[PDB]
Amino acid sequence: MERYESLFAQLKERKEGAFVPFVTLGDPGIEQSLKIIDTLIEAGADALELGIPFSDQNATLRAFAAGVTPAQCFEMLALIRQKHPTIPIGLLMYANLVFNKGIDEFYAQCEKVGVDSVLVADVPVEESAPFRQAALRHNVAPIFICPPNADDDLLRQIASYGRGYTYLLSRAGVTENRAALPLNHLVAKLKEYNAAPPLQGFGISAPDQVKAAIDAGAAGAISGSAIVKIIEQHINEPEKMLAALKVFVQPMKAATRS
Numbered sequence: 001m002e003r004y005e006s007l008f009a010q011l012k013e014r015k016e017g018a019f020v021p022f023v024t025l026g027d028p029g030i031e032q033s034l035k036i037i038d039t040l041i042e043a044g045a046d047a048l049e050l051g052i053p054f055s056d057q058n059a060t061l062r063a064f065a066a067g068v069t070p071a072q073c074f075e076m077l078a079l080i081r082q083k084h085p086t087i088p089i090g091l092l093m094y095a096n097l098v099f100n101k102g103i104d105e106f107y108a109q110c111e112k113v114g115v116d117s118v119l120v121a122d123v124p125v126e127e128s129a130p131f132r133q134a135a136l137r138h139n140v141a142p143i144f145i146c147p148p149n150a151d152d153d154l155l156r157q158i159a160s161y162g163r164g165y166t167y168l169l170s171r172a173g174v175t176e177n178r179a180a181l182p183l184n185h186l187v188a189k190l191k192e193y194n195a196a197p198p199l200q201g202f203g204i205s206a207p208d209q210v211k212a213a214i215d216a217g218a219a220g221a222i223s224g225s226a227i228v229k230i231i232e233q234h235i236n237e238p239e240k241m242l243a244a245l246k247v248f249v250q251p252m253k254a255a256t257r258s
Contacts, residue, residue, distance in 0.1 A: 003088040003116045004141065004164035007046060008197045008219055017256035018220030019210065020199055021249065022049035022092065023227055025076055026068030032238055033068075036231070036245060037080060043246040044253030047088035049201075049222050050077070054097040070097060074113050081114030088164070090117040090143065103134045111138035117164045119143035125157050132161060143167055146190065146198070148180040155186075159193035166190055166198045168218060173202035187217035210255040223252060 011018055021040045026033050037048065052073050059065060068076075081089065091110065098106045098120055110118060118140055120131055125144055135142035141164030146155065148171050158166060168187070171180040183200065190198050197219035204210060205226035213221045230248055234241035 001139065003086060004047070004196070006086065007088050008165075011046065011219070011256075015258050017210070017214035017218060018046035018199065019044060019249070019253040019256050020047045020049050020090075020220055020222040021045050021227055021252075022051065022201075022222055022224035024051035024053055025073050026053065027228075028231060028235060030068060030072060030076060032241075034076060034079065035238075035242060038083070039242045039245050040227075040249060041084055041087065043249035045087075045249060046220065046253075046256075047090065048080075049090050049092050049224075052091055052093045052097060054094070054100070070101065074109050077115060078113040088116045089114065090119065090141075090164070091115055092119045092121065094122050095120050098131070103130055104137070107134040107138040107140050110140050115140060117141035117143050119145070119167055121145065125154065125161065128161065136163075141165075141196075145169055146186060146195075147174060148183070148186060149174055149178040150186070151178065152189075155189050155195075156193055159190060159195035162196045164196050165219070166195045167222075168198040168200045170200055170202040170204065183213065183216040183218060191217075207251040207255040210252050214256055214258070220256065221252075 007018065023036060052070065053067060054070065055067060077089065118135060123131055128142070132142045142161065143164060144158045144162045145167045146158050147169050174180045187198055199220040199222050200213040200218045201222040204213065204221050204223050210221045226248060227245065230244050231241060234244055
């Protein structure tokens with residue numbers, strides 16, 4: 001019962017970084033989204049970063065209310081867990097949905113469907129207590145974003161608070177008084193303070209970029225835009241969309257090996 005931990009030990013032993021693709025659950029549809037995720041895994045994904053969309057009695061237009069509901073998202077999440085029992089599953093989201101459902105209740109449902117971690121992107125690390133507590137109470141790993149221009153205090157806070165993995169923001173992600181430092185420095189400090197293994201994210205869409213992150217010491221990499229662009233390119237060709245996704249994922253994953 002430590003999916004990230006188990007995963008990172010297996011990867012390290014094999015001298016490999018982790019490739020973590022990101023997709024928004026339900027895009028472009030529920031059935032196709034599940035197939036997209038299976039193809040990602042079959043192609044070499046070590047863990048998943050899944051976005052959970054949110055936007056809210058009396059209807060108006062089908063296009064207004066349009067969207068996959070949060071209940072449908074957890075349902076999906078449970079099927080994914082059922083088909084792939086050991087793959088680390090992490091959610092990426094904003095707080096409103098968490099606030100909507102209720103803090104404790106939201107993490108309680110993450111634990112029921114087998115979600116391993118949660119990154120509420122818009123929550124400052126200083127105002128994270130209610131989220132951390134809910135996370136640990138339901139055996140979910142609370143995730144924090146480490147900015148590349150973080151001072152030593154923030155690095156320490158993130159190191160003692162995070163579990164599972166630390167989300168390391170690339171230099172391209174910033175923007176502004178303290179300069180954005182090189183990945184190598186941050187990786188070294190995080191290790192120094194015993195932070196959870198770092199996964200780098202933002203702007204990483206090519207094999208050479210993934211290789212550079214792992215050579216700099218990152219435990220892995222995350223990528224989203226390239227997958228979004230592939231979906232849109234074959235939005236009308238579902239099967240062709242899958243083949244094209246497998247073609248993108250293999251080189252990215254290969255680049256994590258040495």
